[PDB]
Amino acid sequence: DFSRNLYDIGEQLDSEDLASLKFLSLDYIPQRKQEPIKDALMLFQRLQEKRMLEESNLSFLKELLFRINRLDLLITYLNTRKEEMERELQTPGRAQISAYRVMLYQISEEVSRSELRSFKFLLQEEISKCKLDDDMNLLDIFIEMEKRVILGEGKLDILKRVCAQINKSLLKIINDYEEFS
Amino acid sequence: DFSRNLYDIGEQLDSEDLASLKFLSLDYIPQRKQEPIKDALMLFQRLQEKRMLEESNLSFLKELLFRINRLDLLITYLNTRKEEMERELQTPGRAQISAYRVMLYQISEEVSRSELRSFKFLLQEEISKCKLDDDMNLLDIFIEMEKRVILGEGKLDILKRVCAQINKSLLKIINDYEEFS
Amino acid sequence: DFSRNLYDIGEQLDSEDLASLKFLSLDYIPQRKQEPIKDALMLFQRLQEKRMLEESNLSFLKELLFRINRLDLLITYLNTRKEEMERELQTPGRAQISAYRVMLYQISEEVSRSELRSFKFLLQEEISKCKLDDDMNLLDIFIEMEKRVILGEGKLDILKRVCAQINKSLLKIINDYEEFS
Amino acid sequence: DFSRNLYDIGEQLDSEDLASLKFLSLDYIPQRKQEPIKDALMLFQRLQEKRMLEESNLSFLKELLFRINRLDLLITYLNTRKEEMERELQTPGRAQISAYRVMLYQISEEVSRSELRSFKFLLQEEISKCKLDDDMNLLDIFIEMEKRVILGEGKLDILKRVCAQINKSLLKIINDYEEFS
Amino acid sequence: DFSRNLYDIGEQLDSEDLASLKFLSLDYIPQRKQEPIKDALMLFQRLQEKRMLEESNLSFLKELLFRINRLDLLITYLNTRKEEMERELQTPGRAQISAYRVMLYQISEEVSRSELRSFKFLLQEEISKCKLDDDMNLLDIFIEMEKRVILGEGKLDILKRVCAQINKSLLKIINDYEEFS
Amino acid sequence: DFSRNLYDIGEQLDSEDLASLKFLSLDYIPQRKQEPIKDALMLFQRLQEKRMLEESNLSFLKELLFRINRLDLLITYLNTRKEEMERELQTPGRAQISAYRVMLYQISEEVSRSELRSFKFLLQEEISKCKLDDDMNLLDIFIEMEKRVILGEGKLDILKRVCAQINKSLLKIINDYEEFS
Amino acid sequence: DFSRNLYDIGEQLDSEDLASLKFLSLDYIPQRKQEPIKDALMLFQRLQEKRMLEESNLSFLKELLFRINRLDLLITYLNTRKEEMERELQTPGRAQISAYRVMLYQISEEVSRSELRSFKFLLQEEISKCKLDDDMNLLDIFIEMEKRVILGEGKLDILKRVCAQINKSLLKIINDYEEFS
Amino acid sequence: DFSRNLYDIGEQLDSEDLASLKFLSLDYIPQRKQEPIKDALMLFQRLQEKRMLEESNLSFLKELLFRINRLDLLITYLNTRKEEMERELQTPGRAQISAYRVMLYQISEEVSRSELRSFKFLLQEEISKCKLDDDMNLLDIFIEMEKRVILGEGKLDILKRVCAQINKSLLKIINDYEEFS
Amino acid sequence: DFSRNLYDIGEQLDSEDLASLKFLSLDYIPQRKQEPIKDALMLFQRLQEKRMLEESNLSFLKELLFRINRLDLLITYLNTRKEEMERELQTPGRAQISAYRVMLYQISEEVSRSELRSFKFLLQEEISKCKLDDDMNLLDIFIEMEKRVILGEGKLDILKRVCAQINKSLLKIINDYEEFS
């Protein structure tokens, strides 16, 4: 019955937060399969097809909100505290979103608009293969980097070289991924 | 019908006031549902659809104008005196906007753009995830604080932990939490 | 004579108008007799066979045009004033189209495309038995609901729950049918 | 062969031009019989059946291009001076499209897309009978108003009540129509 | 081949001055066909439709470049001496941009940003439907005043109501209307 | 109408006198509404929005101008003597500016521009971490005291503990605390 | 069997990627057999029909995905690395499609949306037969030309008449047709 | 690759130096092309658009740094001595930035802000055609002079007249152009 | 949570102190990246982004206050004695700011505001490249000379040749530079 209230979660979702969910959902939803999604419920439909999100199991949604920092919804509508997802972080295999995706998202939160401009031209300096613009959310840029296979667990060094021209707080985020080695 | 007057109200409504009205609509319009609204008329349409703003019931708009201090509209268009605010504040349930939201507005009401920069210097301690713009409305920041569940009805007294460091006059509004009971 | 003139009058009607007329003809023309209809004249032929629409008695057509707000035809071709449609209220049973169908139609007039997509999700949330698509008109959905016996004067509460997820003006349209209790 | 060679005219005509031509063609082509038209060729076929556009008589097209301000084509392909389009004003009946239509057209050209949104609010101020959409051309709205018989050659000055609120110079365009009384 | 140099002119045209070209084109291209224009070359395409600007006749562009003081482009691309702009003064009707538009432009050139703010305050007193923001331009105000039908060729003197309060030199500019005596 | 003729005040109104008006308007115009005021026109705008400034009642403006002694110009706008401000003393609540704001202003008028230096030293004693910009006149300092809620209507007398060290004439100003009896 | 997975390549391919593949498949699949194609599987089936691409010989697909820079799919589905095509395509006759197609694609990667806008404006001046609109891809333009054999390898440098006014690095691409000698 | 270092060079560029580079780049970058440019690398992207600056040829930037006295970057990061830029004097055409532009730049380096005040007073004495503003950089004024063709290799006597009215030492720069007689 | 205690530093520090910090920060922050900074807390943000200043490592801030002679603040903010700064100086690699920068600062402290005038004359004798202004700090001038590469680690012994001419005791510091090499 709570699908009725899934609606009542999605309406509070920012267009930007949706794009964030799209990026994080890429571990399950194909790069094009995700594209028709225009809101949370569209995502939920895909996740129902993948059986990641359903009335019988909204634990994926629970994490998703934890990952994009929409804890207001986790508590308000899913009626649980963030510490539940922190318990899901306790042991391997309980987290549904990969740590690497989380780190890349954390970057997108750390990187400012001005720095994003640097990211745009700087990546172009790294390769002409990418066609970039001011509409390229860093997360969308990351998707493009995946296409060229210059973004991944074995390409982390590239991100660090990029960070050298941006800031060291990002470099930190990169080093903080060491524990998942 | 009466939307003939709403039009002429909206023409005189400021884009800054509209931003604050979006915050005030949070007790009815979903957190991010109002985000594609560009002018007063679109806002008014949503309120008509939710029947918060009716041709026979303009009392919600009346309050809204009281909340954004537009007395040039209260009398000019709604033909109501300023004293009617206290009339609507006679008993609980009469006001449509929570005193909680009213306080949050007044808290930001006394804030300077230079204090907003100072706030960001303190907000990075509260949550480094908060990617904020130098022209970010404090009310928008409050929405972000909801996301972190660090600002709320019972978490109102979190604000003073950094607001007292910026402008202790805000405390006079925060202490009005007593009007919850 | 004029029955033949209708040949060149029906072309002024939309395909959405036709679909709407099909919904309105649900109290006369069977679903299996509605589907073959491809244009207004096909509809007219069925109504001629059922003697609802004949040159000697076009009072059914007259009402229909009122029901779908095509008064331009009511006056310019059927040569009668829009004010004459009030005669439907002179006595119970005078109207050929039931108020119930009128209400459901008015809803489809009030519901936008974006809201329609929301209705698609909401019904999916209500049950998986109803398979839906992007070409589903709200009136088409109502037909599907009828077939599944979840649409009726005693099922209005379901529509009310769904409308609560959209807007209160739709709820109003439904509540306007309460006077026929 | 020649009229067939004019099939290419549609390659320099815009989709907006076609939409405008459809409105202007309403005096001869049924309100919705025009809709299958996807290009100028399709339009011409309807005009061939209506005998408005013939290989040996393009005077109808000549007027159209003048009315929609595609003078580049009026000269380049139809090889006629724009000055000779004013010959429609020499005696009554020389014009093929009613002055009523070009009046409404000029209005639609004068109104901004942002003002169209403003109109939408005032269109509900007029009535709830008109269902609105973001893709509605003001000419489309005019058609819808005709359907409700609240707009016409005798009801043109109904628009003035709303137009005064958007652009009062439209009132003059309307007032000038009086000269054809 | 100069239509390829129209591109060049457009690149060498100042994006800030393009706004004034739109103002100058008000009596040829409706604000609806102006607002989607992003550069001069797009405007030029509109002027091709009206046949104001073609390779066979760039005299309209010539006049436009005179108004926005781009004499360097008259020489560089139109290959003509600056004095040839004054050929429009030989006989009445030669000019295509009314001195009315020229004077209003000259006013906007004389008015300081600080004086504009003053005019915006005075507009708030003058126009009952005045709406102000940080993107306002005196030329845009003039357009809006036409929409209020308070500014015009015969109503030009209205500007002296506020110009006399600001800068006598602006009033002097207005007095140039005397040439229509 | 006439309101527009009060704009002239700005020509003779010193920016420092405007800053004084800002201090006096602290009980009316919000911080965020006050600080973007760059001239009397922006001030007037805010006053109109709260309908404090209206042709039917300019008494608030009058009182304000009396405080800064610019009501001397009243005889050039309303044609009446500034002495009629004494009417505010007839009964309690007639004055719109609290004697709290008045007394603090009188202090800023009594203290020498060079003596302010000593007040900066006093501020060092009270708060060695406080920023002491040379632009901080006593009125701005008083605002900073409000930011530290050390100064107010009930705290006003606190100033005497350092004012006695500056000049007994300042104590004489402070002795107007008797007006709160 | 395993082909089931290959079918899903299209679930990561974008519509832009597929459109690019269509352009690159112009040396195999006619424009009349490309239109029905809506996804990668459709493309695959067209190629399977004539054994041009089949599960037992994916060497053409290997290049295709390599050429459109989707190396993540070379890994994910083709279970290989870019190195394979880099080595394989070193010598003439190893490519399945003309480098002419590839080079034109590379241009579409280098040309910005903003550059394409002005690129199209030049196309209108360069070829009056063009039917330009917002849905035209740069590659679609090239096809439009081929529809009447007015663009191809024989005039591969024709684009220099447009690129010279846009971006010299596009001229560089043209100057990289050295191996076609 | 190395572009990465050009970025790193650019981070030490002043916004004034950037504007100066824009002026010097006016022999290449279109009048409005540089308007969205907010930092060095953005400019470099426009220089990549023209291929004035490229990893294959950095001599353009190298000269520019010499022109605006940023040898701290030329020597430090581009490993180039100023004498190698001075080596340009061997033969004509070695310089990519005209001595005309360099001369006018040097003037802006010689003229004080206080002399710009007196310049702008004399500018109005010369003509009211210039859209005078307090934020007008002398180089921006030069651009406006170019617009009106009152600045050039044959208009240098205008600046010479102005210089004689400001500072006799300025004449030592503007007269130096005589070497190209 | 430790940066919470940095807030009250920037409030105490002067704009001059900030300017001094900016000069000393040049070894890490680009010559023109710090310019938008309006207070010390904005500086701190940049330092934390570049991780030059960390909550776990405040030793850079510690040094900063030492270098600008604010040792008495170390006990008030970092709770450490000034003697520990000499402890740091005991061994190489502990200091984060170069002695070169520090010594140049000491010079600016020794040079009088009046002497600066005579230095401006000397700077003109040195070169016409450095544009001078009364609002320039000697440290700002130092930066400008560095830009011309006439001031540096190997040119420090050149500048002093005119420094002694104003204050011989400056060289009592400068000549000690030898000890660091």
UniProtKB/Swiss-Prot annotation, chains A, B, C, D, E, F, G, H, I:
Subcellular location: Cytoplasm; Nucleus; Cell projection, Lamellipodium
PTM statement from Swiss-Prot or TrEMBL: Generation of the p10 and p18 subunits requires association with the death-inducing signaling complex (DISC), whereas additional processing is likely due to the autocatalytic activity of the activated protease. GZMB and CASP10 can be involved in these processing events.
DED domain sequence ranges: 1-79, 99-176
Superkingdom of origin organism: Eukaryota
Reported tissue expression: Isoform 1, isoform 5 and isoform 7 are expressed in a wide variety of tissues. Highest expression in peripheral blood leukocytes, spleen, thymus and liver. Barely detectable in brain, testis and skeletal muscle.
Prodomain residues: 1-181
Transmembrane residue ranges: none
Disulfide bonds: none
Protein purpose: Thiol protease that plays a key role in programmed cell death by acting as a molecular switch for apoptosis, necroptosis and pyroptosis, and is required to prevent tissue damage during embryonic development and adulthood. Initiator protease that induces extrinsic apoptosis by mediating cleavage and activation of effector caspases responsible for FAS/CD95-mediated and TNFRSF1A-induced cell death. Cleaves and activates effector caspases CASP3, CASP4, CASP6, CASP7, CASP9 and CASP10. Binding to the adapter molecule FADD recruits it to either receptor FAS/TNFRSF6 or TNFRSF1A.
Assembly behavior: Heterotetramer that consists of two anti-parallel arranged heterodimers, each one formed by a 18 kDa (p18) and a 10 kDa (p10) subunit. Component of the death-induced signaling complex (DISC) composed of cell surface receptor FAS/CD95 or TNFRSF1A, adapter protein FADD and the CASP8 protease; recruitment of CASP8 to the complex is required for processing of CASP8 into the p18 and p10 subunits. Component of the AIM2 PANoptosome complex, a multiprotein complex that drives inflammatory cell death (PANoptosis). Interacts with CFLAR and PEA15. Interacts with TNFAIP8L2. Interacts with CASP8AP2. (Microbial infection) Interacts with human cytomegalovirus/HHV-5 protein vICA/UL36; this interaction inhibits CASP8 activation.
Annotated disease: Caspase-8 deficiency: Disorder resembling autoimmune lymphoproliferative syndrome (ALPS). It is characterized by lymphadenopathy, splenomegaly, and defective CD95-induced apoptosis of peripheral blood lymphocytes (PBLs). It leads to defects in activation of T-lymphocytes, B-lymphocytes, and natural killer cells leading to immunodeficiency characterized by recurrent sinopulmonary and herpes simplex virus infections and poor responses to immunization.
Annotated family: Belongs to the peptidase C14A family.
Free-text note on domains in this protein's UniProt record: The catalytic domain is sufficient for recruitment to lamellipodia but catalytic activity is not necessary.
Name of protein: Caspase-8
Gene label: CASP8
